[PDB]
Design a protein around this nucleic acid. Structure first.
Ligand SMILES: [Mg+2]
Ligand SMILES: [Mg+2]
Ligand SMILES: [Mg+2]
Ligand SMILES: [Mg+2]
Ligand SMILES: [Mg+2]
Ligand SMILES: [Mg+2]
Ligand SMILES: [Mg+2]
Ligand SMILES: [Zn+2]
Lengths: 94, 131, 176, 136, 38, 141
RNA sequence: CGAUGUCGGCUCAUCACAUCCUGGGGCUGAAGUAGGUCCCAAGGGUAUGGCUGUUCGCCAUUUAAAGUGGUACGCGAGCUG
RNA sequence: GUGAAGAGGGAAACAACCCAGACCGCCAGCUAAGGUCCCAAAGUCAUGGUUAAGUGGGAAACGAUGUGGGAAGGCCCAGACAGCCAGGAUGUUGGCUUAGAAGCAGCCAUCAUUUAAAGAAAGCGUAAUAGCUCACUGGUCGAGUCGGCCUGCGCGGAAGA
């Protein structure tokens, strides 16, 4: 039921990722095996508060991108070593 | 009652009713029957006075700086809305008996009647009324 | 901000003169003047006083509460005044007031004469305790503090000068 | 004494302390003490903090020491000139990078864990924080 | 007065005050928790 | 506010001290504070006596702080200390008890009166003898 | 290193305060006397002998006290050796 | 790489650091680092904010209602946080090795009701006594308030000739 809007990324690389993370946004990825992987960026604090709920990895999420609704499932997450911040999450279409 | 300046009108003034408190009358009759609501208050004015009123404030957070001067006799009376009444005019007079007579005259309910005051104790129904 | 947002009523016709920012009040028992901190503007609403911080001073909200408390204390004092009572507990302590000069015998070697600031009256109904009444709270409190300061209460027998309503904790000789 | 036995080589290079920690997550326990600083951390110090850890509960719970020194540290003796060899080892430290989960534990209330972790952080030499297990 | 570099509320009645740019603890219960500096 | 209303009996059976084991979370439901038994049950009461029951007026108020008064042991058990028996009621024709002194009984009743009320403590005294007879503890002159 | 004379003593000092005394305060397991500890304070003051080259240390007797350090472990174009 | 074997401008002074490699002259101009209130040429420039410490213009662990900002909380008109309240229900002389502990040493650890507040620790001192209060609910004057997380800039920590 958790629904997050998100804007497609335009720049990839360490520099672009760090520039995003310095503006309270972190990148992420949508893939589904038989579908073209999609780069995405999504707001940091909204999903960080979504994180506390144990249902985040349990239920099916709804990602909104340029007016498109897709249903996905959180695959994995990598976090900052010491601060409670996220660099990047992995999403599987489902 | 619109704001906390009207929250005000309920944070000491019944100190005047609780300073010399010598009875505890409680009842859970949420039935707001007009005939009985000029029965009980009129009897209060007929025997004791207008000191007691219709404030049915009973949630778990109301009556400690409720009656703060005496009367633990109410101190554990707090389920779903239960009216409260004290009695000044003549220590331990007979308000409770006519309250019970109205209960005989079909007040709906009275949650956990215990003969509140002058057992200094539990359930007993206040057998003696020392007027 | 609540104290500041609480206009103080004015009794029967105590004289009130706001000449700029130096409020003067003339009660039936006294007269008191006080220049206000520039951050506050106080207006006479024909039965009371209202307080407002001037724009440009970040401390106005805190300062105005002090101003309201101060003017309330002033109006109370010039209405009827304040009174502080001290007890000289301990064998060998005596007190007596002549004029505005209070002689204390707390037993050092010599009696101690204290001069009052001339607006504060003193009285001694019983010889063991003193009652001093004043038209201004800060000064009556200061003079009471000075009277206490000569022999502040020793916490071992309660001996010394103390306020009436202040209760001293004692202590033990701990062996004998 | 929290010291390795049968070490392959008696003495080890000073090395460098660089990069981010590996075991950043809490795995065995429910509450962990994650280091947000950097720097070596001596087996004597781990012993002190572990004693404080089991002392805060006085018996309770399960604890895990996720950091093992396995790094000999040599000290040149007093009043001896430089050179003429490399001094003998004197103590063993663990190189700690930011994010490493030093202490881990479960079986006690979270607040009691907060207190115990504070007590041991008082003995530790680098900045720490309290972290809880996450679903990941 | 304990003149210490880490002041803390030693009991329930301790109060923290910043008097003239320095941090102090005053307790009305016992005159032994009085702290300074910090 | 809270003077006294809602009165039952707690304060379970009586030997030696320091709370913890027997009667816990039953109290533990609602809030009487925690170590409240070592300033009228390890630093105020007993050495009037060390084993058997007494009634103690025990309670904390809404801010969870204690204060106590005393009472006198009920005659069901106080005469166990007085006469020193381990017998009891249930078989009066098979297991019965011997006599007890009236001066001792009046001493017990004097403690009773000091630790209770009643308009005529002498008129109330004989009820202790009656209770002794009802439980089968013979009290005589 | 085509020289930068040294341990201790004598005379003369001077500065710092992390105060030995005197001064002002808290807190006390501060009855009082006497203390313990901590904070502020550098104005002034801060032994004499026996032993040893000794600084020091030990001893004897005082004193309100016999402070700790810096100054080329002050001071040999000032002395002694 | 620079000095050695490199002058010039900057960092007060300062072979190595920053900029830049002096053929000579010129009372011409544009720039580099670095700066523009006065010493000393150039902004007492413009805009939006931060700090109250002379921080700037030395220094940590640790401590704190300093202050600015962000996100999410509980709690509340079945009315919140603090004021005054009065604060003090009981089969316990609990299995303690039944010499002394008897609402606050070590103990073993946890049966309930009446039933708005009523969980065998928190402190003052008494071989051990009494007595008062805090983790707590609330009747008038009260509403925005209670405690945490992320942070920016600050405060103490901070004593030498
Ligand atoms: Mg001052
Ligand atoms: Mg000093
Ligand atoms: Mg010489
Ligand atoms: Mg080269
Ligand atoms: Mg050069
Ligand atoms: Mg507060
Ligand atoms: Mg600092
Ligand atoms: Zn305190």
């Amino acid at each position: 039921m958790f629904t997050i809007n998100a804007e497609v990324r335009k720049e990839q690389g360490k520099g672009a990722s760090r520039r995003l993370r310095a503006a309270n946004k972190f990148p992420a990825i949508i893939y589904g095996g038989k579908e073209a992987p999609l780069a995405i960026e999504l707001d940091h604090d909204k999903v960080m508060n979504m994180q506390a709920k144990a249902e985040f990895y349990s239920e099916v999420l709804t990602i909104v991108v340029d007016g498109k609704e897709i249903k996905v499932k959180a695959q994995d997450v990598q976090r900052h070593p010491y601060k409670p911040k996220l660099q990047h999450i992995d999403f599987v279409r489902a | 009652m619109a704001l906390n300046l009207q929250d005000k009108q309920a944070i000491v003034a019944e100190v005047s009713e609780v300073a010399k408190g010598a009875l505890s009358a409680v009842v859970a009759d949420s039935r707001g029957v007009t005939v009985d609501k000029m029965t009980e208050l009129r009897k209060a004015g007929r025997e004791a006075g207008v000191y007691m009123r219709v404030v049915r404030n009973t949630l778990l957070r109301r009556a400690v700086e409720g009656t703060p001067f005496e009367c633990l006799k109410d101190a554990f009376v707090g389920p779903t809305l239960i009216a409260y009444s004290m009695e000044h005019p003549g220590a331990a007079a007979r308000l409770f008996k006519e309250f019970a007579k109205a209960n005989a005259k079909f007040e709906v309910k009275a949650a956990a009647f215990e003969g509140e005051l002058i057992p200094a104790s539990q359930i007993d129904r206040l057998a003696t009324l020392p007027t | 901000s609540r104290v500041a947002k609480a206009p103080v009523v004015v009794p029967a016709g105590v004289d009130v003169k706001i000449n700029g920012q130096v409020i003067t009040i003339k009660g039936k028992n006294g007269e008191l003047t006080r220049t206000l901190n520039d951050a506050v503007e106080v207006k006479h609403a024909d039965n009371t006083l209202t307080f407002g911080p001037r724009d440009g001073y970040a401390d106005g909200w805190a300062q105005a509460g002090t101003a309201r408390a101060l003017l309330n204390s002033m109006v109370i004092g010039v209405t009827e005044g304040f009174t502080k009572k001290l007890q000289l507990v301990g064998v060998g302590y005596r007190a007596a007031v002549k004029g505005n000069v209070i002689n204390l015998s707390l037993g050092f070697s010599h009696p101690v004469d204290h001069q009052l600031p001339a607006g504060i009256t003193a009285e001694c109904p019983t010889q063991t305790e003193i009652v001093l009444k004043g038209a201004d709270k800060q000064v009556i409190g200061q003079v009471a503090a000075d009277l206490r300061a000569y022999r502040r209460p020793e916490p071992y027998k309660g001996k010394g000068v103390r306020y009436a309503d202040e209760v001293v904790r004692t202590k033990e000789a701990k062996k004998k | 004494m929290l010291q390795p036995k049968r070490t392959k080589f008696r003495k080890m290079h000073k090395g460098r302390n660089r990069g981010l920690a590996q075991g950043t997550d809490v795995s065995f326990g429910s509450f962990g003490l994650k280091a947000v600083g950097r720097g070596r951390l001596t087996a004597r110090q781990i012993e002190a903090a572990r004693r404080a850890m089991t002392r805060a509960v006085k018996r309770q719970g399960k604890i895990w020491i996720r950091v093992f020194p396995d790094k000999p540290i040599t000290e040149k003796p007093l009043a001896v000139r430089m050179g003429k060899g490399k001094g003998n080892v004197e103590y063993w430290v663990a190189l700690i990078q930011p994010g490493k989960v030093l202490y881990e534990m479960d079986g006690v209330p979270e607040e009691l864990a907060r207190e115990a972790f504070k007590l041991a952080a008082a003995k530790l030499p680098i900045k720490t924080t309290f972290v809880t297990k996450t679903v990941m | 007065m304990k003149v210490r570099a880490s002041v803390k509320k030693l009991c329930r009645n301790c109060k923290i005050v910043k008097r003239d740019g320095v941090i102090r603890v005053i307790c009305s219960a016992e005159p032994k928790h009085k702290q300074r500096q910090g | 506010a809270k003077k006294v209303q809602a009165y039952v009996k707690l304060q379970v059976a009586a030997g030696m001290a320091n709370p913890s084991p027997p009667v816990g979370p039953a109290l533990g439901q609602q809030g009487v504070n925690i170590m409240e038994f070592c300033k009228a049950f390890n630093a105020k009461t007993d050495s009037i006596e060390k084993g058997l029951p007494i009634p103690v007026v025990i309670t904390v108020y809404a801010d969870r702080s204690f204060t106590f008064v005393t009472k006198t042991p009920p005659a069901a058990v106080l005469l166990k200390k007085a006469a020193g028996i381990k017998s009891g009621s249930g078989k009066p024709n098979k297991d019965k008890v011997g006599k007890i002194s009236r001066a001792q009984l009046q001493e017990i009743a004097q403690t009773k009166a000091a630790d209770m009320t009643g308009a005529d403590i002498e008129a109330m005294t004989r009820s202790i003898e009656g209770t002794a007879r009802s439980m089968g503890l013979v009290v005589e002159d």
